[PDB]
Design a protein around this ligand. Structure first.
Ligand SMILES: Nc1ncnc2c1ncn2[C@@H]1O[C@H](COP(=O)(O)OP(=O)(O)OP(=O)(O)O)[C@H]1CO
Ligand SMILES: Nc1ncnc2c1ncn2[C@@H]1O[C@H](COP(=O)(O)OP(=O)(O)OP(=O)(O)O)[C@H]1CO
Ligand SMILES: [Mg+2]
Ligand SMILES: [Mg+2]
Ligand SMILES: [Mg+2]
Ligand SMILES: [Mg+2]
Lengths: 191, 191
């Protein structure tokens, strides 16, 4: 199986092509953050909307949500969501899923097929939101480092996030708990 | 809460201090790999030992398993496991857990307390094994890059892993599926 190789190969997939970064980010760092944010959003959504989400399925979907970028590389959103490339890329992404599981055990084959051909719409929603939050957090850190080139990126991501908070209350709560003072200038927890 | 800041601050905690690396590794990259390896080991253990593990608790424990290193930094194993520092570091690690959850919601407070003061011995075993596997994988990649300084590291980690495979059959199966050809020189899955 290529599965373990792929997990480490995600470190070789850079994000934010075409933008200057004080700290270069790869897909593995991004996916770690998306898993943790997905967990936090899920806890808030459960308490606010009176439900229980299957956290196993959620975390595993977050874990592998960008795994197809080992083949496609990471295409930034202004290119991926262009009306010319929008549907073609989604078709490309779908061909990648149908080609990765090889020489695996059946429980591994099935679990990975379940994850990669997921049809749980709410888990897909939570991870999509966690993905936007993480992008916003990255832009916050770069601006904090002094990167003027991310100011406009922070503004459009922030504008989109503000719109989402009006329609998804668990996102507004996340914003209130974490995103109004981020990153922390004084990391008092170290001492 | 410092929780979201801490998740991104783990990128500033380097591993393998005192060894030359062709690719510098941080705790967030390492934890992403440990989560995925924990999942794979858990699937194999379930099939081989006839059980079902709580994957929510497992994945969340893997996710935060080194979170206290935002305070302690990453102390390499030959120093941490020295008979002088062994018990003191464990006591230090325990003081760190009792100081991190602040201004959180109760469901977040409790979930994080559950995770950080875990007493599920088998989940702790799986993640400890995934942690050794990941260290072995890193040494394999460095040696593959041509790093002669990791040859001796690869050998002691490999020797320890071989011993573990004699006592934990799910580890031997993982070794047979993934660790006998790692990393892949020819990444055919990209094409
Ligand atoms: N303003 C921007 N300028 C340049 N690149 C951007 C910008 N915003 C995002 N990116 C890059 O695209 C990556 C992901 O961003 P995001 O998640 O917000 O966009 P999508 O959800 O539409 O794309 P996705 O489905 O692939 O996640 C991000 C870093 O490379
Ligand atoms: N031979 C080595 N030489 C130098 N550093 C090493 C070596 N082996 C491991 N390290 C570094 O220690 C980190 C973790 O290694 P490992 O997980 O195998 O050791 P422990 O399980 O005993 O330590 P832990 O409880 O903190 O995980 C690793 C990279 O920094
Ligand atoms: Mg996105
Ligand atoms: Mg993503
Ligand atoms: Mg270890
Ligand atoms: Mg670890």
């Amino acid at each position: 199986s290529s599965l373990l190789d792929i997990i480490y190969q995600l470190r070789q997939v850079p994000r934010w092509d075409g933008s200057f970064q004080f700290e270069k980010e790869d897909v593995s760092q991004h996916s770690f953050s998306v898993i943790a944010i997905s967990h936090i959003l899920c806890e808030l959504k459960e308490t606010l909307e009176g439900k229980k989400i299957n956290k196993e399925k959620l975390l595993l979907y977050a874990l592998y949500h960008d795994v197809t970028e080992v083949v496609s590389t990471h295409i930034i959103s202004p290119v991926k969501k262009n009306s010319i490339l929008k549907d073609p890329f989604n078709a490309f992404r779908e061909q990648i899923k149908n080609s990765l599981f090889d020489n695996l055990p059946i429980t591994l084959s099935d679990t990975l097929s379940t994850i990669l051909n997921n049809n749980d719409l709410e888990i897909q929603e939570i991870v999509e939101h966690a993905d936007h939050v993480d992008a916003y957090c990255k832009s916050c850190i770069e601006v904090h480092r002094g990167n003027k080139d991310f100011i406009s990126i922070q503004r459009s991501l922030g504008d989109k996030l503000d719109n989402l908070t009006k329609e998804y209350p668990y996102l507004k709560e996340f914003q209130n708990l974490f995103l109004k003072d981020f990153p922390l200038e004084n990391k008092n927890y170290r001492y």
